[PDB]
Design an enzyme around this catalytic site. Structure first.
Site, PDB file in Angstrom:
ATOM      1  N   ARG A  72      -4.285  -1.815  -7.959  1.00  0.00           N
ATOM      2  CA  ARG A  72      -4.102  -2.650  -6.780  1.00  0.00           C
ATOM      3  C   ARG A  72      -5.142  -3.748  -6.795  1.00  0.00           C
ATOM      4  NH1 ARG A  72      -2.202  -0.443  -1.719  1.00  0.00           N
ATOM      5  NH2 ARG A  72      -1.124   0.829  -3.288  1.00  0.00           N
ATOM      6  N   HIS A  94       3.147  10.346   3.476  1.00  0.00           N
ATOM      7  CA  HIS A  94       3.873  10.542   2.213  1.00  0.00           C
ATOM      8  C   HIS A  94       4.408  11.961   2.241  1.00  0.00           C
ATOM      9  CE1 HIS A  94       2.626   6.792   0.207  1.00  0.00           C
ATOM     10  NE2 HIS A  94       1.540   6.944   0.936  1.00  0.00           N
ATOM     11  N   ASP A 150       6.665  -0.407   1.203  1.00  0.00           N
ATOM     12  CA  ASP A 150       7.428  -0.062  -0.010  1.00  0.00           C
ATOM     13  C   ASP A 150       8.311   1.171   0.143  1.00  0.00           C
ATOM     14  OD1 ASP A 150       5.105   1.826  -2.086  1.00  0.00           O
ATOM     15  OD2 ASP A 150       4.992   1.519   0.031  1.00  0.00           O
ATOM     16  N   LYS A 208       2.270   1.177  -9.426  1.00  0.00           N
ATOM     17  CA  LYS A 208       2.303   2.618  -9.393  1.00  0.00           C
ATOM     18  C   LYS A 208       3.084   3.039 -10.640  1.00  0.00           C
ATOM     19  CE  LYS A 208       2.013   2.828  -4.325  1.00  0.00           C
ATOM     20  NZ  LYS A 208       2.647   3.282  -3.066  1.00  0.00           N
ATOM     21  N   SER A 216       2.044  -1.893  -1.529  1.00  0.00           N
ATOM     22  CA  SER A 216       2.181  -0.829  -0.534  1.00  0.00           C
ATOM     23  C   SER A 216       2.172  -1.331   0.931  1.00  0.00           C
ATOM     24  CB  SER A 216       1.152   0.293  -0.805  1.00  0.00           C
ATOM     25  OG  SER A 216       1.311   1.312   0.157  1.00  0.00           O
ATOM     26  N   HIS A 217       1.125  -1.007   1.699  1.00  0.00           N
ATOM     27  CA  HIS A 217       1.021  -1.368   3.128  1.00  0.00           C
ATOM     28  C   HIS A 217       0.028  -2.515   3.379  1.00  0.00           C
ATOM     29  CE1 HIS A 217      -2.232   1.508   2.399  1.00  0.00           C
ATOM     30  NE2 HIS A 217      -2.794   1.213   3.557  1.00  0.00           N
ATOM     31  N   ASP A 262       7.700   4.493   0.826  1.00  0.00           N
ATOM     32  CA  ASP A 262       7.290   5.868   0.461  1.00  0.00           C
ATOM     33  C   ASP A 262       6.590   6.621   1.601  1.00  0.00           C
ATOM     34  OD1 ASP A 262       4.883   4.468   0.288  1.00  0.00           O
ATOM     35  OD2 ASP A 262       4.476   4.909  -1.762  1.00  0.00           O
ATOM     36  N   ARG A 263       6.427   5.940   2.728  1.00  0.00           N
ATOM     37  CA  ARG A 263       5.838   6.527   3.928  1.00  0.00           C
ATOM     38  C   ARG A 263       6.766   6.313   5.107  1.00  0.00           C
ATOM     39  N   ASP A 311       6.721   2.113   5.850  1.00  0.00           N
ATOM     40  CA  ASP A 311       5.683   1.236   5.332  1.00  0.00           C
ATOM     41  C   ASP A 311       6.314   0.232   4.376  1.00  0.00           C
ATOM     42  OD1 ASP A 311       5.913   2.669   2.848  1.00  0.00           O
ATOM     43  OD2 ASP A 311       3.779   2.594   2.513  1.00  0.00           O
TER      44      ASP A 311
HETATM   45  O1  LIG Z   1      -7.798   8.492   1.972  1.00  0.00           O
HETATM   46  P1  LIG Z   1      -7.569   7.507   0.872  1.00  0.00           P
HETATM   47  O2  LIG Z   1      -8.156   7.935  -0.440  1.00  0.00           O
HETATM   48  O3  LIG Z   1      -8.125   6.165   1.237  1.00  0.00           O
HETATM   49  O4  LIG Z   1      -5.970   7.395   0.689  1.00  0.00           O
HETATM   50  C1  LIG Z   1      -5.087   7.553   1.860  1.00  0.00           C
HETATM   51  C2  LIG Z   1      -3.682   7.119   1.452  1.00  0.00           C
HETATM   52  O5  LIG Z   1      -3.774   5.936   0.657  1.00  0.00           O
HETATM   53  C3  LIG Z   1      -2.457   5.403   0.301  1.00  0.00           C
HETATM   54  O6  LIG Z   1      -1.676   5.177   1.476  1.00  0.00           O
HETATM   55  C4  LIG Z   1      -1.718   6.382  -0.593  1.00  0.00           C
HETATM   56  O7  LIG Z   1      -2.380   6.466  -1.886  1.00  0.00           O
HETATM   57  C5  LIG Z   1      -1.681   7.799   0.051  1.00  0.00           C
HETATM   58  O8  LIG Z   1      -1.303   8.728  -0.949  1.00  0.00           O
HETATM   59  C6  LIG Z   1      -3.026   8.250   0.641  1.00  0.00           C
HETATM   60  O9  LIG Z   1      -2.807   9.374   1.474  1.00  0.00           O
HETATM   61 ZN   LIG Z   2       3.776   2.966   0.606  1.00  0.00          ZN
END
Ligand SMILES: O=P(O)(O)OC[C@H]1O[C@H](O)[C@@H](O)[C@@H](O)[C@@H]1O
Ligand SMILES: [Zn+2]
Length: 455
Positions: A12, A321, A236, A110, A100-101, A238-239, A234
């Site tokens: 990223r 997720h 993409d 990914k 992602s978000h 996946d959430r 979100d």
């Molecule tokens: O707590 P972190 O390490 O910042 O990640 C929190 C979230 O980040 C992203 O949204 C994704 O990679 C999720 O899988 C993860 O749950």
């Molecule tokens: Zn996502």
């Protein structure tokens, strides 16, 4: 290439700054080389709806083809649709170009190689290949694959809603709008769309359903239209985030309770994974139904690996997720999860508010974040793991330090997406919540008396 874009779960960066077109090319070359080294010349490629998608995806694809890879270009799709492609096409490798978000100018990758989602040293190994020129060379190929209709049918044909439902769907102008509203209608619902036009400027609210601010419009629409349910995706896809017919936010650890009951009922003894941020109530609930609760590390890639290791039929993270293996493929998928939720809710005569309120609840905090430094965050955790005293309790150090007490729990861990410590607390009384908070406050101060403790 900058080292900072190679993270624990994925790649990223910020387009124009740490992620350019040339970087995307060389990342493509590295992934293609690793895929070939695992015996897999066939790689699916997808992208989300970000502004930088077209520029970077061409370079990613070229990098792969310059290894001699056979690329299947699925165009613009949700992340889980790319994962789907890497499960049903010829190849078991796939790359999703997504940020992602994150804000509009962010993008990233990914990565799945020969069935496995890359993380940690595997992601660094890609950076290292490029530095070393340890790269394959060959003349590959590109075939366009239209995969969305196959995905759509796969889900539709296996979901059986027992009654009609009216559902507000907030896509946040992300890529979920290419399918979620259409699919949910096809299941037998009416859909009120919110921000379901794909637009990478994200002009309304960021597609980040983990923040309550980004659900305000959804909650208001659910109430105004007398909808049975609200769903938010979100960027993409996946959430997923869920709100009830009365506007109550259902946090993902509570969603998992409903899903764990469903999956374990057909699969006695099934392993069910959840991350260290999830409520202890989920652990008891899984065990009570005869499942085997498995607590694991935060991070999509880490959860997916753990699912392979344990044979778990379901996993979930507090970030929303959710990973179905039962009746599915084992990847995180907010769209599929929404469909599974609708299946279950439609078989219940009660409204969604009452289905979820029936489960036990504790007093909890929202995720707490303390900004430290990228080069000190792991050392703070290591010092806690070496030095800290937590009183009587079950201590878990698989990801940071979590301590489970008779009446509640606390967690401190390092984020792998930001330079921060992440904390969560839950207890059955306000008194106990404060007791646990004081324990953690004092242990952090014992490591570094200057550390902020904003809880
Ligand atoms: O707590 P972190 O390490 O910042 O990640 C929190 C979230 O980040 C992203 O949204 C994704 O990679 C999720 O899988 C993860 O749950
Ligand atoms: Zn996502």
């Amino acid at each position: 290439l900058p080292a900072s874009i190679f993270r624990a779960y994925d790649i990223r960066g910020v387009v124009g700054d740490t992620l350019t077109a040339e970087t995307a090319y060389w990342i493509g070359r590295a992934i293609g080389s690793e895929s070939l080294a695992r015996g897999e010349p066939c790689v699916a490629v997808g992208r989300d709806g970000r502004l930088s998608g077209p520029e970077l995806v061409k370079q990613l694809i070229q990098g792969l083809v310059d290894c001699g890879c056979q690329v299947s270009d699925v165009g613009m799709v949700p992340t889980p649709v790319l994962y789907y492609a890497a499960n049903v096409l010829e190849g078991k490798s796939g790359v999703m170009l997504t940020g992602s978000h994150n804000p509009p100018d962010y993008n990233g990758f990914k990565i799945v190689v020969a069935g496995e989602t890359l993380a940690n040293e595997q992601i660094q190994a890609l950076r290292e290949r490029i530095e070393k020129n340890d790269l394959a060379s060959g003349v590959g190929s590109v075939e366009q694959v239209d995969i969305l209709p196959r995905y759509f049918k796969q889900i539709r044909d296996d979901i059986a809603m027992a009654k009609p439902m009216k559902v507000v769907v907030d896509c946040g102008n992300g890529v979920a709008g290419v399918i979620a509203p259409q699919l949910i209608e096809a299941l037998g619902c009416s859909v009120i769309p919110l921000y379901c036009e794909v637009d990478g400027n994200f002009p309304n609210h960021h597609p980040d359903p983990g923040k309550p601010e980004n659900l305000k419009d959804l909650i208001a629409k659910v109430k105004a239209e007398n909808a049975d349910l609200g769903l938010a995706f979100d960027g993409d896809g996946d959430r997923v985030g869920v709100v009830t017919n009365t506007g109550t936010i259902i946090y993902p650890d509570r969603l998992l309770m409903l899903f764990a009951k469903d999956v374990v009922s057909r699969n006695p003894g099934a392993d069910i994974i959840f991350d260290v941020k999830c409520t202890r109530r989920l652990i008891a609930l899984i065990s009570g139904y005869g499942g085997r609760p498995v607590m694991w590390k935060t991070g999509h890639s880490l959860i997916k690996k753990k699912m392979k290791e344990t044979g778990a039929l379901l996993a979930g993270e507090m970030s929303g997720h959710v990973f179905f293996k039962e009746r599915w493929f084992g990847f995180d998928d907010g769209i599929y999860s929404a469909a599974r939720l609708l299946e279950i809710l439609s078989q219940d005569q009660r409204d969604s508010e009452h289905v979820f309120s029936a489960f036990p609840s504790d007093i909890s905090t929202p995720e707490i974040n303390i900004t430290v430094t990228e080069d000190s965050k792991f050392a703070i955790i290591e010092a806690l793991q070496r030095d800290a005293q937590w009183g009587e309790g079950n201590i878990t150090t698989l990801d940071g330090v979590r301590v489970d007490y008779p009446k509640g729990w606390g967690l401190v861990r390092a984020s792998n997406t930001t330079p921060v410590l992440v904390l969560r607390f839950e207890a059955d009384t306000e008194e106990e919540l404060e007791r646990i908070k004081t324990v953690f406050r004092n242990q952090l101060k014992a490591v570094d008396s200057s550390l902020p403790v904003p809880f």
